[PDB]
């Protein structure tokens, strides 16, 4: 998790490209062919220029930016399916699968009108687990990933 | 979950075609097998079916009848193997008193079957009843079952699809008595769908197979959202609370040959069509009590709001002066062709239904003054001494009419 | 948007060929499909058609008739599937009184259809009526519909293409009564296109198929600019305000075989030709009230100004002494061949039309003095007691003639 600096940033460099730099790099450090050497020739080329031309500094950054972004979108959607994951969030977070909750509310009702204690946190995770099976939803995937929390004592 | 109690020839058939429609919708094979294309289905099946170790699905249905012929024919159909032979019941060997007497006689086995079916469901919600109120079988047997059920299960809903006798056509000569008694029992025990052959066949025009296909269509469209979970209206009790006698109407009641006119069908035009008396399948500035419109297919809530606004401004409807509709949306089954771009079903409570009883009362009063066809009734124990039952039933119906 | 109400055999046909012309212009397939070349079309279609979920387009038309034969033949045409079977209406089973009586009898279904069609349009502008004033069907049914429509919809325009009986030819023996009554109703309710078989066939010379093809041409050319939005005259009300009884004329009324003479056709020569009595399709220094010329094809406003100047100087026309024309331009459909370099249509209001009624009045007065063919009229309820209706209608027409 890196950040950006402004109190040391140059003057003639705009913050817009500064943000572009901060993203194109972190998208590599986190991520742990021909798209590698050719840009090295581009950067080296600028080192030969006897005059710093911002109008050209962006035409090399933005292409590098758009290439990694195009490469990242390929993974964030196709390989790592986002649609399936968003479909999970809409169902459970946003009450998309409301039919699961009317049963969970039907069961785990008396154990919540009382003030919360140190034991109620587990008294509901089971009831929620009794619920998913009560709606014939049988999937060991994405079932243990959902853990209800009880903000107790603060 | 839910149970279905269908009585008499009318109810037996009603059930046959209702389950035909259901298995068509959910991709259930005639034998109870599941088709390959429907293996990964998302549709909820527990509501009307329970699966078996053999992977087949069994309806939560019970067959009752005073006579064997109808069910025997059913078991000769391609759908025969689907039903549960254990649940089906047939009398070993046309009057309401006789029907109720038999009901008193065969309490034990019927309630055995009902209990067995009930204990197999974790979250049973209510009951569904399909029967005719005129014939001897349906009327009396439904009366007895409703009484003993409301007594046995005081925490379950009881929904019925009661078929009313034709009146313009002069079928049961003793229909007034059976109808009046069944209505007594319905008011005194039934939680909540009136049906008449007259207007039903009128709309069909303008065999029992097609009539009851339409009726099963109505039932399935009523239960769609429950079958297909969504966001709102995820329970039968939600339905009932939003309305509470009823009448129904369905827009896309089109023959298999009448698909040629693929009319651009908005939501506005449908919801409008559901309002006209013509589409109300049943036959004093009488007004409404409640209206519900369930819409299938693509739907934009902006369109729904616009339609509601325009209809409200056009004041095509009338409401009670002493009290302050509803438009719910569902999703079509992914299997049956979507020949209709958007479709609509309407269930409403309207005061005009009172007239029905006024006719039957008029019919009944038109007989009780001359003691017509009471000889058979005196035979049974219930009417062996007197007929105070009849007087109480008539006064109850009169009270209901006054209340309306 | 707009609706078309066509009555009687005359109106039914008129509609058939009018919609034929429309579908030809807009590239609409006979079955309602859209051709590939017209997929990206810019022409506005909502005005006369509404599309359907099946991508087909349906006319905003309703078919009415006392007899089945004509419409039955229509539905055997290649264009049959295009129309909406729901809207079409046919009487299950030649007099004006009978027609109006039936209109009173069949109010409900007709207005049901009309309301259904109306609610499908956001910005309905007016009504279009096509009928004949002589025959029993058209006259009486149009009378009834106009009355109940002006009553029902007090904020919509009502335009008609009324066909007048031939007079030089002695067709309806009872024509004077029907014509006089229809004229009464037209004055008393009609917002705004007179038509006669005599002069129409005269110009045709110098079957009903060709006559009504010409009539449909007139109608389509009248509605062109509305169909094809431009800068000015972008609404029917704009048309009506610029003029307000009418007569019409069209220059390029040329056979499919008469294209051999490709005459260099300016705008000046066309607009000139539209003025002559010969081209006026209908048959005291009588003068004009208003003139409108819609011009199709390439047009230079300098040419238009020059033509207007020259005609004004040549004083070929006469105007009212007590009050102070109009030349609108449109664009041809991109599909039909532009066999004409520039074409012109004229609609005018001229005092001479009064003569028409003077003839019919003379006809009617030539009968009322001897009570000819009143036996059938007495049969109907409207003329069961007396015929004060007739006297009022005659006096109204006399008042209109005096006003002219």
Swiss-Prot record, chain A:
* MF terms in GO: gamma-tubulin binding; structural constituent of cytoskeleton
One cellular component (GO) term of this entry? spindle pole
Keywords recorded for this protein, A-Z: Cytoplasm, Cytoskeleton, Intellectual disability, Microtubule, Primary microcephaly
- In its keyword annotation, does this UniProt entry include Cytoplasm? yes
| Compartments (UniProt record) | Cytoplasm, Cytoskeleton, Microtubule organizing center, Centrosome
Tissue expression summary: Ubiquitously expressed.
Provide one Gene Ontology biological process annotation: cytoplasmic microtubule organization
Is the Cytoplasm keyword given for this protein?
yes
Q: What does this protein do?
A: Component of the gamma-tubulin ring complex (gTuRC) which mediates microtubule nucleation. The gTuRC regulates the minus-end nucleation of alpha-beta tubulin heterodimers that grow into microtubule protafilaments, a critical step in centrosome duplication and spindle formation.
Its quaternary organisation is: Component of the gamma-tubulin ring complex (gTuRC) consisting of TUBGCP2, TUBGCP3, TUBGCP4, TUBGCP5 and TUBGCP6 and gamma-tubulin TUBG1 or TUBG2. TUBGCP2, TUBGCP3, TUBGCP4, TUBGCP5 and TUBGCP6 assemble in a 5:5:2:1:1 stoichiometry; each is associated with a gamma-tubulin, thereby arranging 14 gamma-tubulins in a helical manner. Gamma-tubulin at the first position is blocked by TUBGCP3 at the last position, allowing 13 protafilaments to grow into a microtubule.
Instruction: From the record heading the sequence, give the disease linked to this protein.
Output: Microcephaly and chorioretinopathy, autosomal recessive, 3: A disorder characterized by congenital microcephaly and chorioretinal dysplasia associated with poor vision and nystagmus. Variable ocular anomalies include microphthalmia, retinal folding, retinal detachment, optic nerve hypoplasia, absence of retinal vessels, round areas of chorioretinal atrophy, and attenuated electroretinogram. Most patients have mild developmental delay and mild learning difficulties.
Protein family membership: Belongs to the TUBGCP family.
Protein's name in the database: Gamma-tubulin complex component 4
Q: From which source organism is this entry?
A: Homo sapiens
Organism placement in taxonomy: Eukaryota, Metazoa, Chordata, Craniata, Vertebrata
From Swiss-Prot, chains B, C:
Family indicated by similarity: Belongs to the tubulin family.
Where it sits in the cell: the answer is: Cytoplasm, Cytoskeleton, Microtubule organizing center, Centrosome; Cytoplasm, Cytoskeleton, Spindle
Designated name of the protein: Tubulin gamma-1 chain
Q: Which gene encodes it?
A: TUBG1
A Pfam family matched in the record: Tubulin_C
Q: How does it assemble?
A: Component of the gamma-tubulin ring complex (gTuRC) consisting of TUBGCP2, TUBGCP3, TUBGCP4, TUBGCP5 and TUBGCP6 and gamma-tubulin TUBG1 or TUBG2. TUBGCP2, TUBGCP3, TUBGCP4, TUBGCP5 and TUBGCP6 assemble in a 5:5:2:1:1 stoichiometry; each is associated with a gamma-tubulin, thereby arranging 14 gamma-tubulins in a helical manner. Gamma-tubulin at the first position is blocked by TUBGCP3 at the last position, allowing 13 protafilaments to grow into a microtubule.
GO: which molecular function terms?
GTP binding; identical protein binding; microtubule nucleator activity; structural constituent of cytoskeleton
Is Transmembrane helix tagged as a keyword?
no
- Positions carrying Phosphoserine are 123
Amino acids binding GTP: 134-140
A GO CC term? centrosome
Q: Which key words tag this protein in UniProt?
A: Cytoplasm, Cytoskeleton, Disease variant, GTP-binding, Lissencephaly, Microtubule, Nucleotide-binding, Phosphoprotein
Main location per the UniProt record: cytoplasm
Q: List each coiled-coil range.
A: none
Q: Which GO terms describe its biological process?
A: cytoplasmic microtubule organization; meiotic spindle organization; microtubule cytoskeleton organization; microtubule nucleation; mitotic cell cycle; mitotic sister chromatid segregation; mitotic spindle organization
> What role does this protein play?
Tubulin is the major constituent of microtubules, protein filaments consisting of alpha- and beta-tubulin heterodimers. Gamma-tubulin is a key component of the gamma-tubulin ring complex (gTuRC) which mediates microtubule nucleation. The gTuRC regulates the minus-end nucleation of alpha-beta tubulin heterodimers that grow into microtubule protafilaments, a critical step in centrosome duplication and spindle formation.
Gene3D superfamilies the UniProt entry points to: Helix hairpin bin, Tubulin/FtsZ, C-terminal domain, Tubulin/FtsZ, GTPase domain
Could you describe the post-translational modifications of this protein? Phosphorylation at Ser-123 by BRSK1 regulates centrosome duplication, possibly by mediating relocation of gamma-tubulin and its associated proteins from the cytoplasm to the centrosome.
Q: Which disease is it linked to?
A: Cortical dysplasia, complex, with other brain malformations 4: A disorder of aberrant neuronal migration and disturbed axonal guidance. Clinical features include early-onset seizures, microcephaly, spastic tetraplegia, and various malformations of cortical development, such as agyria, posterior or frontal pachygyria, thick cortex, and subcortical band heterotopia and thin corpus callosum in some patients.
